[PDB]
Each structure stands twice: as structure tokens, then as C-alpha cells.
Amino acid sequence: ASYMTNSPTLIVMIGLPARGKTYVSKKLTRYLNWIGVPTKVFNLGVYRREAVKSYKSYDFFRHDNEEAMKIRKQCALVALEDVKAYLTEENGQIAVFDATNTTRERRDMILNFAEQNSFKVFFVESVCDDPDVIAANILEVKVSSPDYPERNRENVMEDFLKRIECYKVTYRPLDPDNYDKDLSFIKVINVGQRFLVNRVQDYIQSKIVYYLMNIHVQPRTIYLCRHGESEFNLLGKIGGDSGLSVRGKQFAQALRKFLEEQEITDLKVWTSQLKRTIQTAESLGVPYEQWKILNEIDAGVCEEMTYAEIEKRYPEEFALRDQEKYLYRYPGGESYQDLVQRLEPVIMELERQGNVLVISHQAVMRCLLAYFLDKGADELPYLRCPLHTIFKLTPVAYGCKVETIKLNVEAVNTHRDKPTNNFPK
Amino acid sequence: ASYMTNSPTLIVMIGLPARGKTYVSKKLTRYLNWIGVPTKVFNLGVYRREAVKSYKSYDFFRHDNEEAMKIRKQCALVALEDVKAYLTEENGQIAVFDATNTTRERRDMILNFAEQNSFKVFFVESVCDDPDVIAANILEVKVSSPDYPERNRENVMEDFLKRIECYKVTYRPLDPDNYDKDLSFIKVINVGQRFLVNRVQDYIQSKIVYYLMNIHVQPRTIYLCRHGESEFNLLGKIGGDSGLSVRGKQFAQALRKFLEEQEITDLKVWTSQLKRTIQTAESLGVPYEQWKILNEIDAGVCEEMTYAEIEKRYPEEFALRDQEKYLYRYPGGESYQDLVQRLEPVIMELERQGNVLVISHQAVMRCLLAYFLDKGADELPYLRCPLHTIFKLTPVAYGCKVETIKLNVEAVNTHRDKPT
Ligand SMILES: Nc1ncnc2c1ncn2[C@@H]1O[C@H](COP(=O)(O)OP(=O)(O)OP(=O)(O)O)[C@@H](O)[C@H]1O
Numbered sequence: 001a002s003y004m005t006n007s008p009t010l011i012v013m014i015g016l017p018a019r020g021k022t023y024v025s026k027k028l029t030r031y032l033n034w035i036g037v038p039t040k041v042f043n044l045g046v047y048r049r050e051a052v053k054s055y056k057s058y059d060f061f062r063h064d065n066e067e068a069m070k071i072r073k074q075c076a077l078v079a080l081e082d083v084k085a086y087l088t089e090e091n092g093q094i095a096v097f098d099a100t101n102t103t104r105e106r107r108d109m110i111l112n113f114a115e116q117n118s119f120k121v122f123f124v125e126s127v128c129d130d131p132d133v134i135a136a137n138i139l140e141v142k143v144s145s146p147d148y149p150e151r152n153r154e155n156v157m158e159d160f161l162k163r164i165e166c167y168k169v170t171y172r173p174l175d176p177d178n179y180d181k182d183l184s185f186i187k188v189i190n191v192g193q194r195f196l197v198n199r200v201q202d203y204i205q206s207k208i209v210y211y212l213m214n215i216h217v218q219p220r221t222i223y224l225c226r227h228g229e230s231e232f233n234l235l236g237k238i239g240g241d242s243g244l245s246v247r248g249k250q251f252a253q254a255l256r257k258f259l260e261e262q263e264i265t266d267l268k269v270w271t272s273q274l275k276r277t278i279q280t281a282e283s284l285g286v287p288y289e290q291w292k293i294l295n296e297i298d299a300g301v302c303e304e305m306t307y308a309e310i311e312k313r314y315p316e317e318f319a320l321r322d323q324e325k326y327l328y329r330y331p332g333g334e335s336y337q338d339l340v341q342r343l344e345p346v347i348m349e350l351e352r353q354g355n356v357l358v359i360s361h362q363a364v365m366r367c368l369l370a371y372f373l374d375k376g377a378d379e380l381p382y383l384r385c386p387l388h389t390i391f392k393l394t395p396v397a398y399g400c401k402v403e404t405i406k407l408n409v410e411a412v413n414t415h416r417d418k419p420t421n422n423f424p425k
Numbered sequence: 426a427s428y429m430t431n432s433p434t435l436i437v438m439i440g441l442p443a444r445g446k447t448y449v450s451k452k453l454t455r456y457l458n459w460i461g462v463p464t465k466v467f468n469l470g471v472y473r474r475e476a477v478k479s480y481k482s483y484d485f486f487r488h489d490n491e492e493a494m495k496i497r498k499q500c501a502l503v504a505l506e507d508v509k510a511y512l513t514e515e516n517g518q519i520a521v522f523d524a525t526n527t528t529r530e531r532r533d534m535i536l537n538f539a540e541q542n543s544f545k546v547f548f549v550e551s552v553c554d555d556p557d558v559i560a561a562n563i564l565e566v567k568v569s570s571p572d573y574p575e576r577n578r579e580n581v582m583e584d585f586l587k588r589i590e591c592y593k594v595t596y597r598p599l600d601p602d603n604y605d606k607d608l609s610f611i612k613v614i615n616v617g618q619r620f621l622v623n624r625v626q627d628y629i630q631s632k633i634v635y636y637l638m639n640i641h642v643q644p645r646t647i648y649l650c651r652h653g654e655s656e657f658n659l660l661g662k663i664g665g666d667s668g669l670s671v672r673g674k675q676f677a678q679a680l681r682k683f684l685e686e687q688e689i690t691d692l693k694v695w696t697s698q699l700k701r702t703i704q705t706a707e708s709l710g711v712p713y714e715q716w717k718i719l720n721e722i723d724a725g726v727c728e729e730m731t732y733a734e735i736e737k738r739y740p741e742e743f744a745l746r747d748q749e750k751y752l753y754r755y756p757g758g759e760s761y762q763d764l765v766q767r768l769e770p771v772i773m774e775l776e777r778q779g780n781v782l783v784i785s786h787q788a789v790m791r792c793l794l795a796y797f798l799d800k801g802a803d804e805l806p807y808l809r810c811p812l813h814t815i816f817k818l819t820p821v822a823y824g825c826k827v828e829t830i831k832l833n834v835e836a837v838n839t840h841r842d843k844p845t
């Protein structure tokens with residue numbers, strides 16, 4: 001009177017080692033938080049390493065190893081108690097349980113935990129049988145996984161290959177035709193070549209599946225920059241549709257040279273529909289695609305004004321925006337929250353693809369950086385993205401490599417800091 | 426070909442007769458237009474009926490009926506030419522091709538058309554093998570399909586069953602393991618019990634899959650009404666959080682009696698978080714759920730004012746809102762477009778479920794009616810939803826049955842027409 005319509009959700013990863021589970025867990029968790037759903041990942045690798053206080057050879061992972069199996073089960077129970085605390089005491093809505101969970105006994109233990117606590121359960125099983133995908137994932141584990149010592153990885157590969165065989169002995173995949181016909185799940189096959197989806201129960205499960213249709217697990221690189229310096233940038237005017245300054249044109253030429261030197265396979269170039277990004281791309285000698293949704297934030301009645309003019313003409317609005325820069329909405333225009341919402345299709349295409357250069361704008365690029373660098377709404381409107389600097393991004397399971405490349409053309413500074421040190425607040 | 430990320434897309438239905446193809450095509454097309462992607466459905470049943478100028482017995486659908494096969498192929502080619510015009514001359518972005526397309530030869534013809542025109546292709550194959558799902562779909566065809574004469578349907582079932590057998594003879598399903606491993610598609614199995622998705626190539630294909638995870642094909646009924654009359658309604662005041670007038674409470678009591686008479690299985694009742702909808706649901710004697718996203722449109726600095734007061738205090742804003750009521754945003758508040766965007770999770774849950782009563786508000790309910798009755802943004806802010814009237818909606822493939830039930834409790838009129 002009522003029942004289970006308002007329950008939180010436990011997303012349970014399944015798979016053999018080196019299947020992309022931790023990458024998927026982390027990026028899915030970031031996406032769910034991005035759309036406003038409080039979500040936390042629980043990485044059982046961390047739990048078990050902290051419990052045994054040493055790195056473990058493949059024999060630790062034998063299903064026969066009674067002593068190891070008992071330690072590993074206890075770690076799962078501790079993590080589940082942390083899941084419960086998060087979802088019932090800490091205002092979490094979704095918990096993501098990143099572990100192998102390859103046996104039916106372990107999955108039934110999780111399901112019984114969820115039923116006792118009225119948590120919905122959705123399984124994400126990563127199945128890789130393509131030799132190239134497998135060999136790639138395994139090599140990535142060998143090089144970067146923290147489940148082995150930081151240095152001296154010469155014997156990691158041989159051990160890890162044997163650890164996988166231990167899991168293969170007892171692995172029961174989800175069986176949609178019989179044993180698991182009533183469970184809600186998705187099998188992600190070969191990191192997203194195809195999918196088997198069973199019994200999607202509700203809106204949030206549809207969003208989870210939606211996100212996983214856009215994820216890309218193999219290493220990829222994306223490039224972000226602004227249009228070259230514009231005339232309005234030189235004037236300190238926001239918004240508008242002005243063209244490149246002569247220095248912005250020099251930047252566009254330098255950008256062409258930089259892209260040639262980078263030797264990028266199958267480069268795609270995306271711009272907005274505003275002249276300054278188009279003009280930047282036109283100098284590159286390669287096809288490009290304009291996106292309306294990459295247009296700069298709309299400043300409404302403040303379009304084409306300087307900050308000094310805005311503070312003078314609209315002192316109350318100007319102070320409000322400084323107090324609440326993410327949520328503030330220009331009269332007749334947009335807030336950063338509005339901008340975030342309309343950027344979602346570009347963000348999904350950038351989750352999917354590598355070798356894309358996005359030529360956009362200060363506020364737009366802040367949103368894209370906040371998404372791929374996992375920054376919150378508080379910091380998002382203040383992220384620094386100078387004119388004539390390229391951001392080169394390589395996402396990894398626990399974050400994103402960022403390289404900045406300042407090209408050799410000067411530009412004005414358009415970054416206004418939040419006012420500091422004022423009294424009262 | 427697919428050389429651009431935002432090139433046009435041809436969605437191609439596949440399946441035997443009575444698989445929900447035509448319902449899925451139409452509801453997906455409506456959803457795509459709702460989120461701003463111009464989409465048009467092409468119903469090959471209509472093309473072929475118009476060309477052959479008569480109803481056809483199962484004999485027409487034999488794969489070995491050479492003369493019929495040639496006509497059917499020519500209809501597919503005509504429809505593809507209309508697809509081309511829609512996507513290249515009329516600024517369409519997605520075309521939905523509703524046909525059986527059960528043979529590899531027909532699918533290859535479509536694929537070659539798409540490649541010649543640089544259209545992306547995504548197939549939606551409806552596979553039904555559950556006897557209950559099939560039997561239901563077939564009876565629905567028997568009752569309502571326009572592929573048979575309107576009256577005297579006594580021989581329809583026998584003919585239609587033989588027509589299905591004609592198609593079973595040559596049906597080749599999509600084969601993800603070999604023949605069709607490089608095609609982009611979703612198999613919808615038993616109208617959404619489960620799905621097989623292959624090679625999603627872009628954002629919009631992921632949105633198509635997303636929508637299909639929420640669709641419900643079997644007939645269902647949902648109920649929409651407003652909160653009972655509020656004190657602010659009696660005062661002509663917009664917005665706010667006032668409670669029910671005594672007539673709104675009387676309506677809530679009448680609503681309980683109405684719901685009992687409807688003999689509804691597993692009724693769900695959804696309200697907003699505002700007092701007037703909660704108090705309406707509380708008279709019903711059943712569990713109900715509050716949704717913040719069902720709260721009435723936010724009028725910002727005009728909250729709790731009458732239209733006359735708004736016109737006096739903010740004449741320019743009042744006139745702008747009349748010129749552009751869908752997009753206009755109240756200072757400090759919302760536009761109908763904002764309202765549409767935040768309603769998406771409840772719209773998806775209403776696509777999925779039946780036996781739901783939503784008790785909401787004038788602007789909210791306009792958005793929900795615009796979605797399920799396929800109304801455009803121009804008309805959405807002016808749809809009429811009187812206090813104390815229940816809208817009973819039964820979606821069908823070509824629209825929605827609508828019954829309005831005025832309960833016997835008077836209420837003020839809160840509907841303001843656009844000035845002439
Ligand atoms: N706690 C962590 N901190 C940083 N990176 C991590 C962490 N856990 C996993 N990763 C990264 O996840 C990837 C896979 O290593 P993990 O140690 O998760 O191996 P695995 O579980 O066998 O593989 P997978 O999770 O891909 O199925 C590596 O890139 C690794 O650096």
C-alpha cells in the first residue's frame with residue numbers, strides 16, 4: 001500500500017577477467033550521475049586487494065581453493081553491505097557492483113540480498129569471444145591493471161592467462177532461454193558489437209541499455225578546441241556570430257599543420273553553425289560537419305554585450321549569475337543546464353567514436369570537458385579552455401588522459417573568474 | 426553509404442503479418458517527431474491497396490503468384506521513391522518503411538536503394554513465437570485491419586491464416602551470425618519480452634532502441650484528468666499550491682465511484698507533488714505515487730496572479746506569450762517546451778503501462794494529450810482539458826480512441842483562448 005515502484009537499482013556486472021567490466025562500470029556510473037541519478041561504483045578488485053594485503057597468483061582464483069573462496073565470498077558480502085548503506089543511508093539511487101560474478105551461486109546470493117532489501121536488480125554481462133577483442137583487453141590488463149605490481153610485469157601475462165582459465169572452469173553465462181529467463185539483463189557482446197536484452201522493466205533500465213549502445217571500450221582519442229580568436233573576442237563581447245580575427249585565421253592555419261603532424265586516421269571534424277567555428281574548419285582541407293547543438297550558449301538580451309556593459313545595465317542579473325553560474329538563465333537565453341541538455345547527442349557520439357576534433361566555444365567546451373573529465377556542475381562553468389589550445393583526451397577506466405597543446409598564435413583571454421574575497425558570503 | 430554522422434535514416438520493418446509492425450512503426454514515428462526529428466511512415470499496405478484497387482485474398486500473397494509479385498515489387502519501388510523525395514526534397518530526416526520485407530531479395534533491394542542515396546539503414550524485425558501474443562495480434566487484425574472489408578468479416582480469419590502461411594514459406598529472419606552480421610538491426614521478440622541488437626551505428630539508432638525498450642503493443646487503457654477544482658481556480662489565479670475547493674473534493678469522491686465502476690485491474694494512480702492532485706488521489710482509497718515532474722508549469726514571477734493582473738503588470742510579456750505560447754518562457758519560470766522535456770520519463774512509463782490514472786494539471790495534461798493523440802507544438806498549449814472531466818485513452822496503430830467522461834460536479838472554466 002504501495003510497493004516497489006520507488007526502489008533503487010543494483011546494477012551487477014558479470015564476466016570473465018579482461019572483458020571491459022571495470023571500464024563499462026565507471027563510464028556508465030559517470031553517465032548516470034550526469035543525468036542526475038546519484039550512482040556509485042563498487043569495485044571488488046579493490047575490496048579483495050585491501051583484504052588480502054598482497055598481490056595474488058592464479059592459484060588464489062581456483063574454484064577449489066576453499067580458503068581463497070571463503071575470503072572472496074566475504075569480500076562480496078562486505079561490498080553488498082556498503083551497497084546497502086549507500087542506497088538507504090547516503091541517498092544513493094543506483095549502485096554498480098563491478099566483479100566477475102560468473103557462477104549461479106554468487107548471482108543467487110546477490111539476488112537474495114536485493115530481494116531482502118527491495119532493490120531492483122539489472123545484470124550487465126560482458127561476453128567477449130572475438131580473439132582480437134580478447135587479446136587487446138588482456139594486453140591492457142597486463143600493462144595497466146592494479147591487480148598486479150606496479151613494476152616488473154614480465155610474468156604478469158603468463159599468470160593472468162592461467163587466472164582466466166580458473167574462471168572458465170565454473171563460468172555459467174546468463175541463460176535467457178531457461179535458468180535466467182525471468183531476470184532483467186543485457187549481454188554486451190564483444191564490447192558492443194551486439195547485445196541481447198532480456199526483460200527491461202522500467203525507464204531507468206531502458207536508459208542503462210541506451211547508454212551501453214553508445215559506449216566504446218577500446219582506447220580512443222578525441223580532440224577539443226575553440227574556434228580561432230574572433231572579432232567579438234577582441235572586443236570582449238559575448239555571443240553573436242562574428243568572424244575570425246586575423247589571429248584566429250592564423251590559428252586555423254596552425255591547426256591544419258598540427259593535425260597533419262598528428263597523423264590521425266579517419267579524422268572527423270565537427271563544428272557549430274556559427275561562422276567562427278566554420279571558418280576555423282574551412283582552413284583544414286578536410287570535410288567537416290556542422291551541428292546546431294554545438295552553437296555557443298545563448299545569452300538572450302545580453303547577446304553581443306561585454307561583461308562590463310552587462311554589469312552596468314543589469315547589475316542584479318549580473319550578480320545572480322555570479323552566485324549561481326550553472327543554473328542561472330539569461331533572460332531570453334540559456335543556462336549551462338540548458339546547454340548540457342542539448343549537448344547529449346554530441347556527448348553520446350563522442351562516447352562512441354575516436355579520432356574526432358570538435359571545434360566549438362567556451363561554454364560548450366566546458367560542458368564536454370566536464371563530461372569526459374568527470375567534473376561536477378559546480379566546477380563546470382569555470383573550467384579553463386583558452387583560445388588556440390588543443391585538448392587531447394584519451395579516456396581510461398579510472399578517468400581520462402589530458403594533454404594540452406598551445407599552438408603558436410596569441411589570443412585574448414575570455415575567462416572570467418568567479419569574484420573572490422567579498423563580504424558577506 | 427553513411428558518410429556523415431547526421432545523414433538521413435531509413436528504418437525498415439520486417440516480419441510476418443500480425444506482428445505489431447504497423448503499431449510499432451506509427452508509435453516510433455510519433456516519438457521521433459516528438460523529440461524533434463522529422464519522421465514519416467510509409468505503409469506499404471496503403472500503397473498496395475491503392476494500386477490494386479480492391480481487397481485481396483490470400484492467393485495474392487503466394488510467393489509463386491508471378492503477377493502479384495510484380496505488382497508488390499512495383500509498390501515497394503514507388504514507396505522508395507517517395508522515401509527519397511521525403512528525405513532529399515522535403516527535409517525529412519527519418520523514413521519508416523512499414524512492410525513485411527521477409528525475403529533477402531527484398532531487403533537487398535532496399536539496401537541498394539539506401540546505398541545509392543547515402544541513407545543509413547536500420548531494420549526493426551518483429552519476431553513473435555509466443556502463441557498468446559500471436560493469437561492476440563491475429564484477432565486484432567481480424568477485428569480492425571483495413572486490409573479487409575469494413576463489414577461482414579466472417580471469412581477474414583480463415584483467409585488471413587492462409588495468408589500468413591504464404592509468407593512463412595519464404596520468410597528468412599535476420600541472421601546475425603552469418604548472412605546479416607554486418608547489418609544494423611534490432612529483433613523485437615514477442616513485442617518486447619526480449620531483444621537482439623546488432624551493430625548500432627550512431628546516436629539515433631540508440632534512441633530507436635531506447636524507445637522500443639519502453640513500447641507496449643497489446644491494447645491498453647490510460648486515464649487522464651486534472652486535480653479537482655482548486656481554490657485558486659475559483660479565484661482565477663494561476664500556479665501556486667492551493668488545496669481543493671469543496672467542489673474539487675466532491676469531484677474526487679465522484680472519481681472514486683467512477684473508477685470502481687470501471688472495474689480496473691491493477692490500477693495505478695500517479696499525481697504531482699502539489700496539494701491539489703494529492704488531495705484528489707487521497708479520496709480514491711488506493712495507493713498512489715507522487716511525481717515531481719508532473720508538477721504544473723512554473724509561471725515564475727507570474728505565479729499566483731490572474732491573467733488580468735499579468736496583463737496589467739507585464740503587458741509586453743503577456744502579449745509575447747500570446748504570440749508564441751509554446752516557446753514563451755515565463756521570467757523565472759518555464760515554457761511548454763521545458764515542460765515537455767521534463768515529462769519524458771512519465772511519457773515513457775505511460776507508453777509501457779496500462780491501467781494508469783494520471784491526476785495532474787492543465788498545462789501538464791495538454792502535453793500528455795499532445796503526445797498520445799499526436800498533436801503538434803502549435804496546438805499543444807491550446808488543447809482543451811476541462812476540470813472534472815476524465816479522458817479515457819486506448820492507443821491504436823493509427824491514433825488513439827478517446828472517450829471523455831464529464832463527472833457530475835461543476836467547475837470553473839480555466840481555458841483561455843488565443844485572442845483573435
Ligand atoms: N582501481 C583502479 N584504478 C585505476 N584503474 C583501474 C582500477 N581498477 C581497474 N582499472 C583499470 O581497468 C582496466 C582493467 O583492469 P581490471 O584490473 O579492472 O582487470 P580485469 O577485471 O581483469 O578486466 P575488466 O575489468 O576489463 O574485465 C585497466 O585499464 C585498469 O587500469
Ligand SMILES: Nc1ncnc2c1ncn2[C@@H]1O[C@H](COP(=O)(O)OP(=O)(O)OP(=O)(O)O)[C@@H](O)[C@H]1O
Pocket residue numbers: 440441442443444445446447448468470471562565566569570571572821822823
Ligand atoms: N491504414 C490504416 N489505418 C488505420 N489503421 C491501420 C492502418 N493500417 C494498419 N492499421 C492498424 O494496424 C493494426 C494491424 O493491422 P494491419 O492491417 O497492419 O495488419 P498486419 O500488417 O497483418 O499486422 P501488423 O502490422 O501488426 O504486423 C490494426 O489495428 C489496423 O487497424
Ligand SMILES: O=P(O)(O)OC[C@H]1O[C@](O)(CO)[C@@H](O)[C@@H]1O
Pocket residue numbers: 233236237238239240296297299361362363381414416
Ligand atoms: O559563461 P561565460 O564564462 O560567460 O562564458 C561563455 C561566453 O564565452 C564566450 O564563448 C566568449 O566570450 C561567449 O560567446 C559566451 O557567452
Ligand SMILES: O=P(O)(O)OC[C@H]1O[C@](O)(CO)[C@@H](O)[C@@H]1O
Pocket residue numbers: 658662663664665721722724786787788806839841
Ligand atoms: O498555459 P495556460 O493556458 O496559461 O495554462 C496553465 C495554467 O493553467 C492552470 O493549471 C490553471 O489556471 C495554472 O495553474 C497554469 O499556470
